[PDB]
Ligand binder design. Structure first.
Ligand SMILES: Nc1ncnc2c1ncn2[C@@H]1O[C@H](COP(=O)(O)OP(=O)(O)O)[C@@H](O)[C@H]1O
Ligand SMILES: Nc1ncnc2c1ncn2[C@@H]1O[C@H](COP(=O)(O)OP(=O)(O)O)[C@@H](O)[C@H]1O
Ligand SMILES: Nc1ncnc2c1ncn2[C@@H]1O[C@H](COP(=O)(O)OP(=O)(O)O)[C@@H](O)[C@H]1O
Ligand SMILES: Nc1ncnc2c1ncn2[C@@H]1O[C@H](COP(=O)(O)OP(=O)(O)O)[C@@H](O)[C@H]1O
Ligand SMILES: [Zn+2]
Ligand SMILES: [Zn+2]
Ligand SMILES: [Zn+2]
Ligand SMILES: [Zn+2]
Lengths: 418, 438, 438, 418
């Protein structure tokens, strides 16, 4: 029932980020200031596991609760439950309140009261009390922004799906209890499970142990590992085909290329075939953000043609369009429309002609930037092929490695590496 | 100490008929119940809960009892409907008492019929919480298995299906003609019928029947014989069958032969599209028996325009076959579902994924943020273009292969279920080679 | 009798820096606390409650303590967050006990930090009611003053601001470069730094910092010196400043120099429009420091078409300056708010006030009572006409005065804040006379 | 803590109107029949003060409550609170129930139950019980009409902002407690605070006393009065500029002129530069009501041109348009549209062509009447200037004074004076 960082694998950056929280929990008054922390990511990537590991590293109790227990209760219950949860946590401090499925309470009627109670409690406890609240969710896109205001979950962390190195380390962690054979190559398993989560890998090793026992053996052999993987694939886990890997690699490479070419100030992050996940900007910065967002799809079209574009661009595309709309309907960055602003569902009833103008202008912006991105990808198609080769091999490369590959072709790129 | 005491079962796989696949699926559970320590020897965690869902009378409880008997372990049965009167009130037991009584008799099976009675979306809530607590907490390592059963899986509290508690579901389908035949044989053992009857005819004559219905037919025939002379004859079977089938045709859904033909053509069109497409998934078995129940883009992570076009094609295959075989006046409402999905998919391609050239790479997350009528008109025109293009393609494909499809439809109306491989063979007998997607 | 006992404060206006206007505003309260009977000699009722709001670390609690020390009166402090554990439960005090303890020590100050903890829009409700009852009921004539503080004034229960209870609010803004310099001086007294440092550079290098941040910087420098030799040098200050500024730039909003230039141009355009308009209100000071927080036609009773046109002009001034200085690609999202208001205003002029000739004197109270598309088209066309007309006018005005505006922007990026009079002087140095609206 | 009519100033008409209620409260059975009374007006005009004065004149207790205390309560509380309020009032009868912010409960979900409870209680108590319910509100335009049905608040009274005479009398009332100097001219203060409310005047005298004390004096002098007024104006109270006064005077004069010229039966009220605030009609009566409503704006345009029209017409204009709509969509008073009736949000989905016809016809009606009003104002521009001069001087004149000024120009006007 004890958990520590030894049981978590493949997220060294997150461990570094939460080292401060662990130091705080070990001795709060000495440290003093994070209040709340949000963990978001697909199911089975280790959010609850990470919270429990943080709790165990500081040798503090771990209070686990779900939004589901608060959401469905009769009228007036959920708020008193939140308040009593915080009081019981205060009494056992120092401790951690873990709230899984925080989206169940924090969407953007009765749930509203419970949400407000949560906000009150988050703001009320001083740092002297010695509590840290960790929330977890699969749906960060539908969260009430109030939850992220300073003092309330003012620090968010993404837990990504594991790459090959992460998958290998996870397989090591979960192999420890099981008595595997010498022949098994967990590295091969890692390279054979792109798109798996830590939970998927646990289930794979467990099914392999089950099949081994069913065959009366005493050691788990590559036979059973491959059998379990084939079982799951043939009809829980979803694996990425090599063709899919190539498509994703090209999309992400186009994204990074646009990031590294645009006349912007945003820093380009690492390139990986794992899916990705309040300031002032000017018209040009926004055009270039759109460009970056359209880069992956532009690469898809340049390499595979109009019939090869994929759903992987979905997110990106939406954001791009959304941005264009804000540029036209909220920020008056269109000449044809002018410096008029309507949207905040809008507030005033708009005529159809004006909506048609807004739509036409959004299409103009998006298609212009899309042609720009397609042209850029065409110009640098060969260094991009090089990057994609390195990417399909290692599954992930650094922005610095991207720049290096590109200068190998006599191309100097902007120093935007994060 | 109010919970019923567990008892062994006098039922085994010999008493179940027509679901060999389900038997394969539960072989793992039976091996575990025969020897838990062997399973856990390598720290391999086994399954805790298992949900059986299917129409009433298809053999869910029978399957649970048969599993219990194959391992020679006790079988503790309780009904979800009884839970409130069982585990709520002064003097009444608690759910924990059920699980502990099972632990003492371990290895054994706890069977919960009508689990939906407690786990839909009050006191029943208290009982449900007790059950969930026990499922998450209780150390099942001793070798007990919880099997839940329900006829209404569409109204199950998703909390019941979270990992660790009933995280494994199994569908028990209605028996096809061979399955009905085997069930009739199984229940004939006790009745000792007369010589003249050939049960295969009874099977072929009862599409859409469940094992329970065949039981009731044979028992009514034996009763009529007793009321009539030591021997059960075709006369009495035909009388009982006419009675039950007439009584059921009104309330309920019976498979008319015309309905059977329509269904066969629809499913054959689906399968044909699946087997002709360039880049698709693997084709499953073809059958006029419903293939599941509640509890279309999730087989892969990303899809490309071609994969989505081909998915649309498949979805339109059934209607295309209907039109080719029966003409524009013979298309049916059975395609309803399919059609919707197809159209829905097309919409996503145009308004969400920017896979239309005319529309462009614009994306509208969904539902709509005040869109001009011109844009909606463009989206609709493009959706209609895609759908009609794929529909003409599918109609052409069916036209090309109309004769081998007629062959498949005949084999299907006969056997009620065929394999993808049999499909390929029927097609090879017409000098037509199909891709090995089976 | 659980409430904390009141104690005098060792803080006065000498310890507060960079908010001389707030000091003027609270001079009345300090005079009252020095001698209540003098105030009430002519039956002049004084203020009861005072709300201080501003970003965290700008000196709200410091200001309250300084007011308490200037009058030499006790200072009773309590946190809103503590109220529930303070005034709720068996044995716990009551809010009345706080107010009466203050009355006995009168004249004094009750300071309630984080008043938002109790007064947002349960037991906290009970405590809030107790506080309100005391605010309305208690005879403060003895000379006690309640000062509330909050960082989140946008979520305050408006009941807290009704007349008689916290009916007076004061904003404490972030310090400009001069204010930061004075704060650094204040906190230098205790630290005795080395000779080489010129704190003015540190001030200029810390836009958007609060007094607390400057405190933390100087204390970290003194700590590093101790860990390093009796003297604090530029080396250690630069190290600490780099540390804190790097750590803050990520989470939070820091003022880049480009951001500072954009903000300066925006605010300068606002002020220029204000100073050029024919019939407007008086122009306030120009500064790149935010000028308020939550808790555009209310300065007069009635407005005419010209006044509204000029208000629109002002609202569009910032964006017009942005475009003139940076071109169509340099306009920014900072104008967002402004733009909305402008457009909103135009709409009211057309659909609510009948100030359009093309539309006529028709009025649609708001939102809409089934209006034909033709009418919405006319309203939109007229709104666009108004907004673009005023925007071209504003762009022309900025073009005409681009050089003196560059001068103002330079002075602004230097000092971070300037007066309307300094604006007029900068403009007079270019042979341009502006109206005396200061 | 005692209040009477001596503490209220500048509303003799309201005191006359409530004399009957005071007689009722002094001896209810002898009198017998008003049940409820609504006071509406801008904040700080003395609604609560008037209620307390009524309570004190009859020597009866005064039960004060706010809608705000009823509105926010958990489900099922507000109705039991209303019922218990009426029971406690019945026990202490004769008394007054005063409900401030009656709009908080009486708008047009859970609040609905409390509102119904209020209605039940209003209807249930007979006149024998001896209670009077006085409601107060700033937003009479959003009140549920059920509150005004006979037997429930069947008498409404508007409390207007004080004119110069009212402001002077209020300054007298509030000066009594303060020890002013001989030099102070409260009449000058009155003429210097157009658009002030009684509360604004109280605050002015109080700030003046504060400044006097701060300067160590013993008497409040014009210095302090002017200083306090300058303080409030320079950065609580809103004063009307003389240009604003001229605009308002012209608007109100146009209103009155239309009232006195139209072929109607409605009576014209007094003319004042203070803002203003179930029968059968025929098409002509409605056209003339529209005309009157458009008179103020028409005068504004005639005197100051298209760039001088003001927001003061807002109310008027809206009503006019609303009326036109009812004439076209509800009463079939348009030939082009016909005797069709749709609106009661309408009930049946209407085609766009018909909505365009309705809008075009409404515009026709409004513009016709607006040209009519502009022409009338042009014809009588000089007598109107005379009225405006008298109005800027006295701030208020009677309809009879209006007619007199006009006959001084050889113009006989209809005897519509109220
Ligand atoms: N990064 C990881 N490292 C080690 N184990 C993991 C990781 N991710 C998932 N797991 C395993 O998968 C299972 C699910 O983890 P959990 O944290 O509950 O998922 P989530 O928090 O995303 O709901 C756990 O049993 C855990 O051991
Ligand atoms: N597939 C089958 N094979 C053999 N017998 C069956 C089958 N399905 C149903 N039966 C018979 O029908 C009866 C009903 O089975 P049961 O499992 O109780 O129904 P359900 O699972 O729908 O509640 C049993 O007596 C059983 O012997
Ligand atoms: N304007 C200022 N002048 C001098 N010192 C300041 C100023 N603002 C903040 N400080 C210092 O920063 C610290 C925080 O002040 P405090 O009033 O507690 O913050 P807040 O009011 O935001 O809660 C105090 O120790 C104070 O000395
Ligand atoms: N007509 C008036 N005569 C005398 N005093 C007035 C008048 N109007 C307002 N006041 C003063 O203004 C303050 C607010 O009065 P109140 O009746 O509470 O306003 P309302 O009823 O409009 O909310 C009171 O203290 C009162 O003395
Ligand atoms: Zn992308
Ligand atoms: Zn189908
Ligand atoms: Zn602005
Ligand atoms: Zn008017």
């Amino acid at each position: 029932m004890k958990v520590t960082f030894k049981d978590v694998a493949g997220i060294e950056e997150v461990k570094e980020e939460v080292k401060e929280i662990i130091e705080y929990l070990k001795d709060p008054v000495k440290f003093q200031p994070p209040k709340g922390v949000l963990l978001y990511g697909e199911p089975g990537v280790g959010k609850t596991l990470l919270a429990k590991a943080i709790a165990g590293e500081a040798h503090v109790p771990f209070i686990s609760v779900s939004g589901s227990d608060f959401v469905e209760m009769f009228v007036g219950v959920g708020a008193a439950r939140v308040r009593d949860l915080f009081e019981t946590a205060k009494k056992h401090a120092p401790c951690i309140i873990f709230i899984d499925e925080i989206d169940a309470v924090g969407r953007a009627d009765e749930r509203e009261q419970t949400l407000n109670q949560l906000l009150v409690e988050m703001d009320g406890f001083d740092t002297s009390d010695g509590i840290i609240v960790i929330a977890a969710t699969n749906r960060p896109d539908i969260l009430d922004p109030a939850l992220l205001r300073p003092g309330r979950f003012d620090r968010q962390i993404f837990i990504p799906k594991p790459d090959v190195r992460g998958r290998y380390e996870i397989l090591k962690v979960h192999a420890r209890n099981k008595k595997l054979a010498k022949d098994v190559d967990l590295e091969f398993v890692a390279r054979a499970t792109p798109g798996f989560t830590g939970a998927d890998l646990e289930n794979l090793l467990n099914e392999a142990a089950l099949l081994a026992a069913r065959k009366g053996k005493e050691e788990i052999t590559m036979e059973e590992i491959e059998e379990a993987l084939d079982r799951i694939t043939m009809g829980k886990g979803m694996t990425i085909s090599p063709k899919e890997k190539e498509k994703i690699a090209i999309h992400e490479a186009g994204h990074a290329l646009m990031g590294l070419v645009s006349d912007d100030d945003d820093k380009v992050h690492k390139i990986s075939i794992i899916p990705r996940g309040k300031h002032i900007y000017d018209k040009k910065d926004l055009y270039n953000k759109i460009l970056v967002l359209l880069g992956g799809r532009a690469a898809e079209e340049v390499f595979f043609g109009k019939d090869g574009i994929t759903t992987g661009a979905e997110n990106d595309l939406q954001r791009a369009t959304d941005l264009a709309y804000r540029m036209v309907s909220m920020w008056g960055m269109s000449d044809k429309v002018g410096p008029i602003a309507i949207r905040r569902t809008t507030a005033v009833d708009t005529s159809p002609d004006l909506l048609r103008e807004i739509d036409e202008e959004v299409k103009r912006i998006i298609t212009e930037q899309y042609e720009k991105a397609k042209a850029i990808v065409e110009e640098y198609k060969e260094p991009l092929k090089a990057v994609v080769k390195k990417l399909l091999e290692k599954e992930t490369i650094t922005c610095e490695e991207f720049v290096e590959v590109f200068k190998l072709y006599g191309i100097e790129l902007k120093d935007k590496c994060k």
